[PDB]
Amino acid sequence: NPIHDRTSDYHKYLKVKQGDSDLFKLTVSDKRYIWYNPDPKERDSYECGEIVSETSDSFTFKTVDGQDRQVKKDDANQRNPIKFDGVEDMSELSYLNEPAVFHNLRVRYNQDLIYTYSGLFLVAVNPFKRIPIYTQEMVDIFKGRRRNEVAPHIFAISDVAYRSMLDDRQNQSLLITGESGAGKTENTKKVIQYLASVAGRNQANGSGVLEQQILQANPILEAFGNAKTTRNNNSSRFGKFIEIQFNSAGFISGASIQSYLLEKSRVVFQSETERNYHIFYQLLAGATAEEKKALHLAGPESFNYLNQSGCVDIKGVSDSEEFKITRQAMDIVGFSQEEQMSIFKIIAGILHLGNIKFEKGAGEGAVLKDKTALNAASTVFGVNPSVLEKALMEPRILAGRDLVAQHLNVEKSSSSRDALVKALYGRLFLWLVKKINNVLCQERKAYFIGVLDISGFEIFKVNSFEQLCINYTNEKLQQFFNHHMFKLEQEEYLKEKINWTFIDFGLDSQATIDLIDGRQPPGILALLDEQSVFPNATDNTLITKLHSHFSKKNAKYEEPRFSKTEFGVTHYAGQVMYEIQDWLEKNKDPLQQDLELCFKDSSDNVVTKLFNDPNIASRAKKGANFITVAAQYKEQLASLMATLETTNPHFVRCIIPNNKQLPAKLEDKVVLDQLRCNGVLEGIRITRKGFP
Ligand SMILES: [Mg+2]
């Protein structure tokens, strides 16, 4: 049993190192310690001090320099017996408090133990380096093993959900929380590898045909769905709910991917030092000189969609290599060779579209002096350049019932070009996901385990509509933790009359949630939608309206005095200032119909499907108008949350060590902020003072 063999890799990489004769002596000491703040200003910077004396209501302890300090016993953060240092489940700690909890995660983290239980759920501190704890060898250890029987691991909570699914015959869900960069996607890939292995077929041929395809779907979506942001070199710029499906027997019958809220503005814009989607750099770097020639490609610095941020490389990543990986994954999944080259036709097409330079004509209307990029794009898309040209600068609209040809100025033409690009990319992504799902959908399930991997809470210097939707989602996920851990739990206790005193854990994001998606009174998304369908609305009337409804009326809202285009939302993870520029158009998400009539005619079999498939090209109507991005998203989310509620949820709290993407650098302020807003200690408390 490698578990019991102190020389195994299991003990080496997943267990706390044996202490020595000098640590034993410290461990049996009778002295008592307290966590304190040398600088009261810096409440998260702690030092250890020895308790030197005590009165009935206080402790007197010695600081590190040597000074003596008094504190009330009620405000004292006592240090646990150091035999607790490194303990695998912090519900076992005698003193549950912020420095004690952080300290324990520190001790474990200092020896590359990134997993720690926190009562009913798992905590995972991002190591920002590789640790050899996800081999098939490690997988096999956790099989069938009970949580208390093995060390904290993501494999272990995965196992627990599996058994619970088989024993209770109830669908399960793995909810992995975290801010951007914390580790949600890595752990997500782990849950699936472990479910695929312990539950994959095992005698010939299928066994990990399906299983392997399930596996190969992620690298597909990461190349198209992930990019470098200032907070994570592999940021997930779309959310996903993965259904891993099983039969009554417990074998994998299939899997389903639901995608959410792809950041299509990334394709046309990138803040400084960020990148566009990985796929763009992979192609330009991984294509043969031949395809390079067929797709009229050249270096990233030659494309407008790629040469603005000042970054085209990710340290330690080789795009040309990831290109090979994406391709092999598409082959496994089943992307025909014709389909694959259409896909990069779209990718190269998008790049040429971005190179189009609109100029002012004699009139205020725009002209296209150089048709080079126009013709190149037309060429790879399989569309008529002059139709596309007219569609871009002179689109036709209805004025009443009349048919009026417009002539957009430079600005408008560029925005329209950008709209095309974003529709192409987003429809493509939706198509890739559709195609994957056919492949993994080949049998009615009896049960499933759902893994939720969303875009995590983020803050940039500039926060737009995309970030509101991201942070609102993160706020609902946190509320789902609150609900289940504290609310649903005590509701039983009071229900089953065990006597029982209700406790308020002070965790509730409802006011923030309501401020955003409230219907009556109307919240931010609702006012947005209103303005969005108001013929005379501007970004300026929108913010004014927001201020009018919430400023000095909603406790979670702030009208800043330093700007007239931003508003602050107080989220669980902190206050975020949002810039109102472009929200109306972002919400409306418009595309000129002449553009679509121009692509519906393409000769490419992939492109044609992006503009004729009702499931990709059609838009629901909210009466006289098309549904908005906001109304649509709010609807897709509510459905996900309703589905979650019909599962047994397992929470993994992912935690970022610092804001630098660095290993071996656990910063207390950063970590403690997360522990607080995540509700980790409260989580341990409910578990301890309760009846699970
Ligand atoms: Mg991610």
Write up this protein.
There is one protein chain. This protein is α+β, with helices and mostly antiparallel strands. It has three domains: about 1-30 and about 80-460 and about 590-620 and about 645-690, no CATH class; about 30-80, SH3 type barrels (Roll), CATH 2.30.30.360; about 460-590 and about 620-645, Methane Monooxygenase Hydroxylase, Chain G, domain 1 (Up-down Bundle), CATH 1.20.58. It has a seven-stranded mixed beta sheet, sandwiched between helices. The site of magnesium ion has 3 residues, from helix 6. The PDB classes it as contractile protein. Keywords: calmodulin-binding, nucleotide-binding, motor protein, actin-binding, phosphoprotein, myosin, cytoplasm, ATP-analog, methylation, coiled coil, ATP-binding, motor-domain, contractile protein. The assembly is monomeric. Crystal structure of myosin-2 in complex with ADP-metavanadate.
User: Major sheet: order of its strands?
Assistant: 6-7-23-8-17-11-12
Helical fraction equals: 40-55%
Please tell me what the overall shape is.
Answer: globular
Ligands (ions, cofactors included): magnesium ion
Number of strands: 23
Tally of separate helices: 25
If you compute it from the alpha carbons, what radius of gyration comes out, rounded to the nearest whole angstrom? Answer: 28 Å
Output the structural class: alpha+beta
* Main sheet summary: 7 strands, mixed
Portion of residues in beta strands equals 15-25%
Q: Whole-Å distance between the termini?
A: 31 Å
Protein name: Myosin-2 heavy chain
Subcellular location: Cytoplasm, Cell cortex
Main location: cytoplasm
Region (Actin-binding): 637-659
